[PDB]
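Work package 3, deliverable 3.1, input record:
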Amino acid sequence: LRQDAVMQQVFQMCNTLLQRNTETRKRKLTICTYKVVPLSQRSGVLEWCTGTVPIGEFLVNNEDGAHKRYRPNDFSAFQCQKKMMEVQKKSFEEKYEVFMDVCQNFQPVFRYFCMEKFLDPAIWFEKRLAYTRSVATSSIVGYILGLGDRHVQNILINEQSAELVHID
Amino acid sequence: FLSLARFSDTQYQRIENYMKSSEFENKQALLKRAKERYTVKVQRELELDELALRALKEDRKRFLCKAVENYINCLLSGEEHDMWVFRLCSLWLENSGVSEVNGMMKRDGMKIPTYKFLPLMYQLAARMGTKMMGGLGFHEVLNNLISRISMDHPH
Ligand SMILES: Nc1ncnc2c1ncn2[C@@H]1O[C@H](COP(=O)(O)OP(=O)(O)NP(=O)(O)O)[C@@H](O)[C@H]1O
Ligand SMILES: [Mg+2]
């Protein structure tokens, strides 16, 4: 857990750099951070982000996923995963055409998170703007630091503030 | 033709830089250290990396051939950009082992006026050889081009 604590320290430095510049202070561009307290070389404790859910859990959940709820007629997450794993030992062109075929039968439904959670148009607009700003700032910081392994289970979204939180 | 040649050359140069980049060497050294359950995954990586290398080499060869062809067409289609004969010769000399490049040079470069090759005649002459002469060999094509230039402008 020491690597996570160091990454949190760098995120705090990025937040402080963004705070002292008026262009980003006006836009409230910040990185969500959680306290990590290493205890040994093998065990440790860290902050649990209350009120946050994984984006993969919200989107491609088998039981009550967003894709299943909003697009029942489209391909399921398991079907797309199996199709992608099948073309793993194949040509690059076959991989590209499989990916395009999957994307054709898999339409994004993530825009409904703010619609179903913030019925007020003013609050919905504020949450969407905060989400877009958080995504842009986190993406730029991750590119600068070369952050990797940003899969669905490594990204958390706050239910109250609609701000992305990066873990692992 | 010049714009397409420049774009193809840029892509080929980027691919060549990626091949010679320190990141590629580090990845290869990591794979070599890893190869020294565990067997299945070792041979899986030693096959996936070879497949990726073959695909990258094929893409590099395609970009190189397209760049050489477009440079030849640009040289044959005007005289304003005669300075790019240096780039065409640099690609030809650095990729003399490719049969397609040598065949394209033999088929189309002989139509190019010889006076465009005059400034780099020293470098053309310094590459003369005999060990790899043949119908599609680089040495025979270079010798024929040099002889034709000498016949046109002996002085
Ligand atoms: N700081 C956190 N706050 C809230 N939930 C968290 C936090 N860290 C992990 N989680 C949850 O734990 C799940 C599993 O992630 P994690 O605890 O990193 O285990 P893991 O995926 O096995 N990672 P790793 O041990 O590095 O291979 C995530 O999908 C989150 O739902
Ligand atoms: Mg994880």
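The interface with chain A takes residues 55 of chain B (CB under 8 Å).
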